[model samples]
Target: ATIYAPTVRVTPNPAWPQVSWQLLVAKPSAARIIDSPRINVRPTPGELQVYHGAGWAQPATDMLEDSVVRAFEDSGKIAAVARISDYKLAIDVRRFESDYAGQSLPAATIELNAKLLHSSDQRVVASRTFTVARPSSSTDTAAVAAAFEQALTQVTTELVGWTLITGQQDSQT
Candidate 1:
């Protein structure tokens, strides 16, 4: 079966006190899907016809990265936001066989495991991993995209909350 590329959406962590005045979102590194046998399925006989029309002019990764960045910008969580050219955040998608045996399940996940360095002092403020996951109904491109977005939304919400609490504490000092 011809696999249609999937789409992605990202939400930015909300802006809060003590957070950098400028929000920088790295170009979002390429999304990696853990290799799995379930992902190597073929389309059933006459199941679906492949569209031979012209495809995306840009790489799937590029298009998805842009879409995620735009989603963050539209969230209005920061005063100014820019995509980091060199630095990027990595995301991974894992597919697994469902409990039903015949069904397929996919998980969308994100992780932030780095220190926030001060440009002047180069000090590390925080370091931790942030991750989220959502299950997909099937191998359909749209379903996978929806699951990814759902997982991202959950992660963004947590990040926003963390930012808010951290900002409040910083202000008290």
Candidate 2:
């Protein structure tokens, strides 16, 4: 069996707003299918299964947390970022799979909802959903994994930027 560890690469955007407040990235929540280590594939809208002999290095939720934290830290736009802080970022992932979408090759798809909360008041400062589908070059496991890498990078970049901007705005008001 092959264990694929996909890493998300996100560059800091010069336009992103810098925040003085700290951020906590909570562990993501998802359905059992999407939370497992299995490399899920959806051949049809109603069919879902895992790729044989291949799996992720960690569970989906853990992977998301790891990637998201890294994304924020690498951005260098925040003064403080950790697991607990002034604001918290919670993620609820609805879709994490390789979907054929009636095409010959599957695309790595991800749909997740994010909530930014003010820790002092426990209020939801902002909420948003992000989705990405990156087409795979081939039907092989390696190709699908590569597509996931791209999809995750795109979503994580968007997520980190959104959280920073939203948190900053909420703090100002």
Candidate 3:
């Protein structure tokens, strides 16, 4: 049995969007691990079940990019911010094995790397990496969604603050 957990990656808005700055959601790089939901011995023959939860309305990539865009919109840092339509950000993802011989883990880990680029200049203004863990319960999609939401909230807060600081710095120069 293999388990799939969703995660997200985000970037802070550039401070000086007033000077023709555009926000673009560059492709993200992500890593995931496959594990069994049930706890059992390593060599023992046991059945493990893989369940799909309805935590996110969309796939992991869409959810993550949307989260970053929403963070920028809510931060009120730039004149205008939108996802890149003509050029989509390039993303790379890797999957691994998370289950081991011993110990029981409730959640699986997902790692993400993201970058924010200036559409006009093609300059990377901000970049960040996020690690999120989603809990795996027998029948708890809501709980898993809540956990992912909480992680995104934390990431959004950091991005918002970063944008504010950058905006201030640009105003001086």
> What lDDT does the true structure give each of the candidates?
0.42, 0.91, 0.44
Model 1: weakest 10-residue lDDT segment is 33-42
Candidate 2 scores a C-alpha RMSD against the true structure in Å of 1.0
Ranking by TM-score: 2, 3, 1
- Which ten residues in a row are the worst by lDDT in model 2? 76-85
Q: How close is candidate 2 to the true structure, as a TM-score?
A: 0.97
Candidate 1 vs. true structure, TM-score: 0.50
lDDT of 2 by residue, 1-173 (tens): 89999988789999889878998888899999899999899999899989999999999888889889988888889878886488999999999999999999999999999999999888989899999999999999999999999999999999998998898888888
Question: What is the lDDT for 78 in model 3?
Answer: 52
Look at candidate 3 and give me any clashing residue pairs. Answer: 26-89, 27-89, 27-90
lDDT of candidate 1 over 1-173, digit per residue (tens): 33434344444443434333443444433324222112222144223222232223334345434654555466565445566521223332222111122335545444443233333444444444666656667756556545655655665555444533443343354
- TM-scores for all candidates? 0.50, 0.97, 0.52
Candidate that would win on lDDT: 2
- lDDT: which is higher, 1 or 2? 2
56, model 3: CA deviation in Å?
A: 3.6
* Over 4 Å off, model 3: 1-20, 27-55, 85-105, 118-126, 134-139, 160-173
Candidate 2, superposed: residue stretches over 4 Å from native: none
